[PDB]
Amino acid sequence: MKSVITTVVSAADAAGRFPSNSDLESIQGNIQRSAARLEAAEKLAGNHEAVVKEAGDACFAKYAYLKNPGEAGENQEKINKCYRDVDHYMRLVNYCLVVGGTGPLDEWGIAGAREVYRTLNLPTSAYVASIAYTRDRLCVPRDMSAQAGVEFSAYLDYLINALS
Amino acid sequence: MKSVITTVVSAADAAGRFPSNSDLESIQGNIQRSAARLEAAEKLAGNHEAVVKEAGDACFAKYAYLKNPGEAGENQEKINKCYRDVDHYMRLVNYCLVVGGTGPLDEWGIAGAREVYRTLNLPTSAYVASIAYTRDRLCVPRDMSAQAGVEFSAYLDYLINALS
Amino acid sequence: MKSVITTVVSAADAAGRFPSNSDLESIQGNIQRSAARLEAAEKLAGNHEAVVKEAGDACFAKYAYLKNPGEAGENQEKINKCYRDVDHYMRLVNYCLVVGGTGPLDEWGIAGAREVYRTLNLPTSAYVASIAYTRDRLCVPRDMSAQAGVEFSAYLDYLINALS
Amino acid sequence: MLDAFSRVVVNSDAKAAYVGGSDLQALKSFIADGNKRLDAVNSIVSNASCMVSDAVSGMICENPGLISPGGNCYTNRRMAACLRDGEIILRYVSYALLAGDASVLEDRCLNGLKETYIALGVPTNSSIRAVSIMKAQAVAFITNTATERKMSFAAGDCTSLASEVASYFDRVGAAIS
Amino acid sequence: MLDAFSRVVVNSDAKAAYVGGSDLQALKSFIADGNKRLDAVNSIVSNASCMVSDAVSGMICENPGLISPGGNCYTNRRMAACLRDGEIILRYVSYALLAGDASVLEDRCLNGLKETYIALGVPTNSSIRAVSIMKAQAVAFITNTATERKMSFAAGDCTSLASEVASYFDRVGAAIS
Amino acid sequence: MLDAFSRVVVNSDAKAAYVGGSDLQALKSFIADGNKRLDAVNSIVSNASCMVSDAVSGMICENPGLISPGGNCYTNRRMAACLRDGEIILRYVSYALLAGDASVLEDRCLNGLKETYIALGVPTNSSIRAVSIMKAQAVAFITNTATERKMSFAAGDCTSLASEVASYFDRVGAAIS
Ligand SMILES: *C(=C)C1=C(C)[C@@H](Cc2[nH]c(/C=C3N=C(/C=C4\NC(=O)[C@H](C)[C@H]4[C@@H](*)C)C(C)=C\3CCC(=O)O)c(CCC(=O)O)c2C)NC1=O
Ligand SMILES: *C(=C)C1=C(C)[C@@H](Cc2[nH]c(/C=C3N=C(/C=C4\NC(=O)[C@H](C)[C@H]4[C@@H](*)C)C(C)=C\3CCC(=O)O)c(CCC(=O)O)c2C)NC1=O
Ligand SMILES: *C(=C)C1=C(C)[C@@H](Cc2[nH]c(/C=C3N=C(/C=C4\NC(=O)[C@H](C)[C@H]4[C@@H](*)C)C(C)=C\3CCC(=O)O)c(CCC(=O)O)c2C)NC1=O
Ligand SMILES: *[C@@H](C)[C@H]1/C(=C/C2=NC(=C\c3[nH]c(C[C@H]4NC(=O)C(C=C)=C4C)c(C)c3CCC(=O)O)/C(CCC(=O)O)=C2C)NC(=O)[C@@H]1C
C-alpha cells in the first residue's frame, strides 16, 4: 500500500539496509502533513452520501445518452451501480487521505479499471465527469481548510489522470 | 504433432489470440489437399507388407557386407529387426499422410535416430537405401494418382533428408 | 572439497565427459607428491599442542593490548578460545596436507571468517601473527624434510593471504 | 497438442496399426463437413467479447456477494482478472473446436487450474456458472439461434458441432470440481 | 506491506466503511507520538551490530554444543550465516516498529522460515533464545535503560513502544516453533 | 564432492581429530596402488560406448516388451534417452572409481532419480538390469577377463578395484528401488 512509510521501508529492504536518517526524516513529513489530509478524510467520511449524489447527478446531466437502450445507464439497477462506483472511488480517496499516499486508489480502484470499463462498455469520460465535478465543486474555506482542499484535490486529479 | 491445425493454433496461443481468418483459411487447405494424401495413406495401409519386403530386400542387395560377422545384419533376428524398422517408417509415413504434416515422423521416427543408429552401429545409408528404393519404385498412375504420389514422395524425401 | 581429484572430476562433469588422459595424468601427481604432504600432516598431528601453544603465545606477546578490558583477550575464557582457534586452523592445515588441496581451509576455516572476525571484533592481525609465527618457526630439516616444509608453509601462506 | 487426425494416429500407434479405409471414413466426414467447423469457430470468435462480458456479468447478477467486500470479484483488479480468465477459457475451447480435439484445452489450460484456483481462493462453483453461460451462448451462435444477433450461413445442420463445443465447455467444470 | 494507517484502511474496507473521526483518534495519537517512534527506531539501528553480536554470542555461551563439531554454529561459514540471520531478523523487526505494523516482518521474513530452518537443520530453539536476547536489548535501548550505553532523549514514557517491539520479537518464535 | 582422502577428513572432523599415522596407512595404500586405479578407470572409459550399447540391448533382448508400443524404449526418442541414461550412470560410476568415493555418484546422479523415474514412468526394474549388465562388463574389463577384448597391463591383483566398482553399480539399484 504505497505511503511515506512503505516507500522508505521497501527501498531499505531492497538494499538490505536498516532504517537510517533519511528514512526517519521522510516520516517526519507524516507528522507535519497528516492534519491537513485527516481533515479532508473526516469531511469526506461525514458527508459522502451528499457528495456522491451530486457527482452522479452531474454525470447523467452531462451525458443524458447514458439512459438510452443498450447504454451503461439504461435502467435503474445500472444507474445505481454508477452511483455506487462513485461512492467506491470517494471511499478510496478517503483511504488515500488516511494513508498519505495513492496505494488504496492504485490497488483497489485503478489497477484493472481500464480493462473492466472497456469490456463492460462503461465510458471513462462519465467517470471523469463525476470526479472532475467533485474537484470543481470543492469550496474553500466553506468545506474545509485550504491545505485539506489541496490534499483532497490532488487525489481527485490523480484519479482523473489515471483514467486519462 | 505438427499439422496445419496445430501450427496455426500454436501460433495463435503463443500470441494470446483467438483463431482468426488466416487460421481458418490455412485449414481450408486441409479440405482441398486431404483427398490426395488420404489416397496415398490407404494404398500404403493396404499394401505395406509387400512394400517393406521390397525395400528391405533392396537394402541387403545393395549392402551385402551387412550380413558379415559383427555387422548390423549378421544373423536372422537382426535382419528381421531391419525389415521391422522399415515397416515402422512406412507406418509413420502413413501417419503423416493422415495428419497432413511431418509430426509423426519427427516425433516417433527422427528425434533421437542419429544417436540410436550411431550407438548401435546401424549405417544410415542402409536406411536411406530402403527409403530411396521405395521413392523410386513408386509408379504413377499404376500405384496411385499423381498428387497422391507427390504427397507420398514428399514424406519419403523428408525422411531421407532427415537422415542425411 | 577442492583437491586434484575433485578439480578434474568436476571439470569433466561440467562438460559431460568421461575421465580422460589429462585427468588420470593429473592424479599421477598425487602419487608423486603425497609423501611430502603426508609427512607434514603426520608431524602436525603428532605435535599440534606444542605448535599451538607457541603460536598463541606469540600472538599475545606481540599484542599485549588484547588483554585490556573490552578487547578480544580480556579474560581467560576468551584467551582460551583464541588458542582453540589456532588449534582449529592447524587441524585444517593437517586436513589440507592429507587431501592435497585447500578445500578444508576454504570450506571450514576461510569462508565467512571475515564477517565473523569483524562482527566479533577479533583483529585479523592477531590471527596472522599466530600463523606467520608458525611459518617462520618451521625448521628444516630439524622438524621435517625440505619438501614437507614447502607443503606445510604453502598452506600457512595460503591462510595468511586469505586473511590479508 | 493433437487434432482430430493425430488423435486417430495416436490410437492406431498404440496398436502398431496403419490407418486404413475403415478408420478413415470418420476423418473423411470431418473433412467433408470442414466448412461448417470453420463457420462454427467464426461465430464464436466474432462474438467473443460480448460472450465473456455477458457471462461474467451473469455470474455476478445471480450471486451478487461476489462483488461485496471480500467477494472474489471485488476491486477492479479482481474483476479484470476474472474477465481475463473468462476470455482465456473461451480461447482454449475455441482452439479445441477448430482442432476437433480437447487436448490443447486439457494440456494448456485445464491442467493445474483446480490447484491454482484452490490456492488463490477463486470460487470454482461461480467459475462453473460463468462457463455454463458461455456454453449456452456458444451453442446459440453455432446454430444461429442467438436472440440478439444473427450471422450469415448456407442453411444446414450443425447439431454435432454444437454438441461437441458443449462437451469442451463441460470439460472445464469437470477439471475444476 | 501495510503500515499502521493502511492497517486501519484494510479493516474498514472489509466493511465497505469510510474511516472517520471515531477510528481516527488512534492514528491521531500515532502521529502525536511519532517523534518517540523515530527515536525508538534510532536507538535500535544505532546499536544493531552490538545487539546481533552479543545475542548470538549469548545463545552460544548458554549452549556451547552449538560450536562443537556437528553443532549448527560450527565452522566460520555457519557462524557467519547465523550472525547474518540475527541481523536480518533485527532489520525486519526494526521495519515493523517504524511502520507500526507486523506485516513486513510476517510477509517478507517469517513466511517460509520454519520450513527453511527445518530443511537446513537450523535449531529453532536456539534461534528463539538469540531472538529473546535481542528483545531484552531492544526494550533496554528504547527505554534508555541499557547498562553499558545511554543515548539522548527528551524525558517521557516509551512503555508502549517497548511493548510493541517486544510483540514483534515474539512473533519470530511463534512463527518458527 | 568428496574423494577417498576428504572422506577420511570428514570423519576426523566429526571428532575434532587430526589425521595421523594410524588413519593414514589406508590412504598410503590407496596411493601405493594408485596406478592400478588409473588403469581400472582407463579400461572402463576405453570401452564405454560398447558397454552402454550392449547393456541396454541386453535389457531389451531379455524383455522385448520394452520396444512394443507403449514400451518405455519404444520410438527412437525413448531409445535415445535410455542410451543417454545408461552412459550418464556409467560416467558417474567412473567418477566414483577415480575418486575412491561414492559421493559424486550419490549427490549428482542418484539424488532425485527414483522420483524422476517414477514421475516419467521409466521402469526401475529394467533400469536395474541394464545397470547389472554394465556391472558385469566393468568387473571383466578391470580384471582383464572380458571375452571379446584384452587390454595391456603389468600383471597383478585388481580384485579390490573390481569389488569397489561393483559396489558403486549396486548403489544405483539401491537408490531407485
Ligand atoms: C444479470 C442480470 C444477467 C445477465 C448478464 C444475463 C447472463 C445470461 N446470458 C445468457 C444467454 C446468452 N447471452 C448471449 C450473449 C450475446 N448475444 C448477443 O447477441 C451478443 C452479441 C452477446 C452478448 C450480449 C447469448 C447468445 C445467449 C444464449 C441465449 C440467447 O441467445 O438469448 C443466459 C442464459 C444462460 C443459460 O441458458 O444457462 C444468462 C443467465 N442473464 C442475467 O440474468
Ligand atoms: C555469554 C557469556 C553471555 C553473553 C554474550 C551475554 C548475552 C546477553 N546479553 C543480555 C542483555 C543485553 N545485551 C545488551 C547489548 C549491548 N549493550 C550495549 O551497550 C552495547 C552497545 C550492546 C552490545 C554489548 C543490552 C542493551 C542488554 C539488555 C540488559 C542490559 O542492558 O544490561 C542478556 C540478558 C538476556 C535476557 O534478559 O533474557 C544476555 C543473556 N550474556 C551471557 O551470559
Ligand atoms: C541379447 C540377445 C543379449 C545381449 C546384447 C547381451 C548383453 C549381455 N552382455 C553381457 C556381458 C558382457 N558384455 C560385455 C561387452 C563388451 N565386451 C567387449 O569386448 C566389447 C568391447 C563390449 C561390447 C560388445 C562384456 C565385457 C561382458 C562381460 C562378460 C564377457 O566378457 O563375456 C551379459 C552377461 C550379464 C551378467 O553377467 O549378468 C549380458 C546379458 N546378452 C544377451 O542375451
Ligand atoms: C453451422 C456451423 C452453421 C452452418 C454452416 C455451413 N457452412 C456451409 C458452407 C460453407 N461455409 C463456408 C465458410 C467457411 N469456409 C471457409 O473457408 C472460411 C474462412 C476461411 C469459412 C468461415 C464455405 C466456403 C462453405 C462452402 C459453400 C460455399 O462455397 O459457400 C454449409 C453448407 C454445407 C457444406 O458446405 O458443408 C453449412 C450448413 N450452416 C448453418 O445453418 C449453421 C448456422
Ligand SMILES: *[C@@H](C)[C@H]1/C(=C/C2=NC(=C\c3[nH]c(C[C@H]4NC(=O)C(C=C)=C4C)c(C)c3CCC(=O)O)/C(CCC(=O)O)=C2C)NC(=O)[C@@H]1C
Ligand atoms: C522513548 C522512545 C524515548 C523518548 C522519546 C521522545 N522523543 C521526544 C521528542 C522528539 N524526538 C525527536 C527526534 C526524532 N524526530 C525526528 O524527526 C528524528 C529524525 C529524523 C528523530 C530521531 C524530535 C524532533 C522530538 C520533538 C521535540 C524536539 O523538537 O526536540 C519526546 C518528547 C515528547 C514528544 O515530542 O512526543 C520523547 C518522550 N523519550 C524518552 O525518555 C525515551 C528514552
Ligand SMILES: *[C@@H](C)[C@H]1/C(=C/C2=NC(=C\c3[nH]c(C[C@H]4NC(=O)C(C=C)=C4C)c(C)c3CCC(=O)O)/C(CCC(=O)O)=C2C)NC(=O)[C@@H]1C
Ligand atoms: C587391474 C586394474 C589391472 C592391473 C593394473 C596394474 N597397473 C600396474 C602398474 C602401472 N600402471 C600404470 C598406468 C596408469 N598410470 C598412469 O599414470 C596412467 C595414465 C596417466 C595409467 C593408465 C603405471 C605408470 C604403472 C606403474 C608401473 C609402470 O611404470 O609401468 C600394476 C603393477 C603394480 C603397481 O605398480 O601398482 C598393476 C597390477 N594389472 C592387472 O593385471 C589388472 C588387469
Ligand SMILES: *[C@H](C)[C@H]1/C(=C/C2=NC(=C\c3[nH]c(C[C@H]4NC(=O)C(C=C)=C4C)c(C)c3CCC(=O)O)/C(CCC(=O)O)=C2C)NC(=O)[C@@H]1C
Ligand atoms: C458510472 C460513472 C458509470 C456506470 C457504472 C456501472 N458500473 C458497473 C459495474 C462495475 N463497476 C465496477 C468498478 C467498481 N467495483 C468495485 O469493486 C470498485 C472498487 C472497489 C469499483 C470502482 C466493477 C468491477 C463492475 C462490474 C461488477 C458489477 O457489476 O458490479 C455497471 C454494471 C455494468 C453491466 O452490468 O453491464 C454500471 C452501469 N454506469 C454509467 O452509466 C456510468 C458510465
Ligand SMILES: *[C@H](C)[C@H]1/C(=C/C2=NC(=C\c3[nH]c(C[C@H]4NC(=O)C(C=C)=C4C)c(C)c3CCC(=O)O)/C(CCC(=O)O)=C2C)NC(=O)[C@@H]1C
Ligand atoms: C465555493 C467556492 C462557493 C460555494 C459553493 C456552494 N456549495 C454548496 C453546497 C454543497 N457543496 C457540496 C460538496 C462539498 N461538501 C463536502 O462535504 C465536500 C467534500 C468533502 C464537498 C466538495 C455539497 C454536498 C453541497 C450541498 C449541501 C451543503 O449545502 O453543504 C452551495 C449551496 C447551494 C448549491 O447547492 O449550489 C454553494 C453556494 N459557495 C460559496 O459561497 C462559494 C463562492
Ligand SMILES: *[C@H](C)[C@H]1/C(=C/C2=NC(=C\c3[nH]c(C[C@H]4NC(=O)C(C=C)=C4C)c(C)c3CCC(=O)O)/C(CCC(=O)O)=C2C)NC(=O)[C@@H]1C
Ligand atoms: C535396417 C535398415 C538396418 C538394421 C536395423 C536394426 N535395427 C535394430 C534396432 C532398433 N531399431 C530402432 C528404430 C525403430 N524402433 C522404433 O521404435 C522405431 C519407431 C517407432 C524405429 C524406426 C530402435 C530404437 C532399435 C533398438 C531397440 C531394438 O533392438 O529394437 C537392430 C538390432 C541392433 C542390435 O541389437 O545391435 C538392427 C539390426 N539392420 C541392418 O542390417 C540395417 C542397417
Ligand SMILES: *[C@H](C)[C@H]1/C(=C/C2=NC(=C\c3[nH]c(C[C@H]4NC(=O)C(C=C)=C4C)c(C)c3CCC(=O)O)/C(CCC(=O)O)=C2C)NC(=O)[C@@H]1C
Ligand atoms: C512405374 C513407372 C513402372 C512399373 C513398375 C512396376 N512395379 C511393379 C510391382 C510392384 N510395385 C510395388 C511397390 C508399389 N506398390 C505400392 O502399393 C506402393 C506404395 C503404396 C508402391 C511403391 C510392389 C509391392 C510391387 C509388386 C506387387 C505388384 O505387382 O503390384 C511391377 C511388376 C514387376 C516387378 O516386380 O518388377 C512393375 C513392372 N510398371 C510400369 O508399367 C511402369 C513403367
Ligand SMILES: *[C@H](C)[C@H]1/C(=C/C2=NC(=C\c3[nH]c(C[C@H]4NC(=O)C(C=C)=C4C)c(C)c3CCC(=O)O)/C(CCC(=O)O)=C2C)NC(=O)[C@@H]1C
Ligand atoms: C630452525 C632453522 C632452527 C632451530 C629452531 C628451534 N626450534 C626449537 C623448538 C621447537 N620448534 C617447534 C615448532 C616445530 N615443531 C613442530 O613439530 C612443527 C610443525 C609440525 C614446528 C614448526 C616446537 C613446538 C618446539 C619446542 C619443542 C621442541 O624442542 O621440538 C628449538 C629449541 C629451543 C627453543 O624453544 O627456541 C630451536 C633452537 N633450531 C636450529 O638448530 C635451527 C637453526
Ligand SMILES: *[C@H](C)[C@H]1/C(=C/C2=NC(=C\c3[nH]c(C[C@H]4NC(=O)C(C=C)=C4C)c(C)c3CCC(=O)O)/C(CCC(=O)O)=C2C)NC(=O)[C@@H]1C
Ligand atoms: C472469473 C470467472 C472468476 C474469478 C477469476 C480470478 N482469477 C484470478 C487469477 C488467476 N487466474 C489464473 C489462471 C488463468 N491464467 C492462465 O494463464 C490460464 C491459462 C493458461 C488461466 C485459466 C492465474 C494463474 C491467476 C493468478 C495470476 C493473476 O492474477 O492473473 C483472480 C485474481 C485472484 C486474486 O485476487 O488474488 C480472479 C478474481 N474470480 C471469480 O470470482 C470468478 C468466479
Ligand SMILES: *[C@H](C)[C@H]1/C(=C/C2=NC(=C\c3[nH]c(C[C@H]4NC(=O)C(C=C)=C4C)c(C)c3CCC(=O)O)/C(CCC(=O)O)=C2C)NC(=O)[C@@H]1C
Ligand atoms: C543463528 C542465530 C542460528 C543459525 C543460523 C543459520 N542460518 C543458516 C542459513 C540460512 N538462513 C536462511 C534464512 C534467512 N535468509 C533470508 O534471506 C531471510 C529473510 C529474508 C532469513 C531469515 C536461509 C535461506 C539460509 C540458507 C542460505 C544461507 O546459507 O544463507 C545457516 C547455514 C546452515 C548450514 O550450515 O547449512 C546457519 C548456521 N544457526 C544456529 O545454530 C543459530 C540458532
Ligand SMILES: *[C@H](C)[C@H]1/C(=C/C2=NC(=C\c3[nH]c(C[C@H]4NC(=O)C(C=C)=C4C)c(C)c3CCC(=O)O)/C(CCC(=O)O)=C2C)NC(=O)[C@@H]1C
Ligand atoms: C534406459 C536404461 C531406461 C530408460 C530410460 C529413459 N530415461 C528417460 C528420460 C530422463 N532421464 C533422466 C535422468 C537422467 N538425466 C540426468 O541429467 C541424469 C543425471 C544427472 C540422469 C540419470 C531425466 C531428467 C529424463 C527426462 C528428460 C529427458 O527426456 O532426457 C526416457 C524418456 C522418457 C519419456 O519418453 O518420457 C527414457 C526412455 N527407459 C527404459 O525403458 C530403460 C529401462
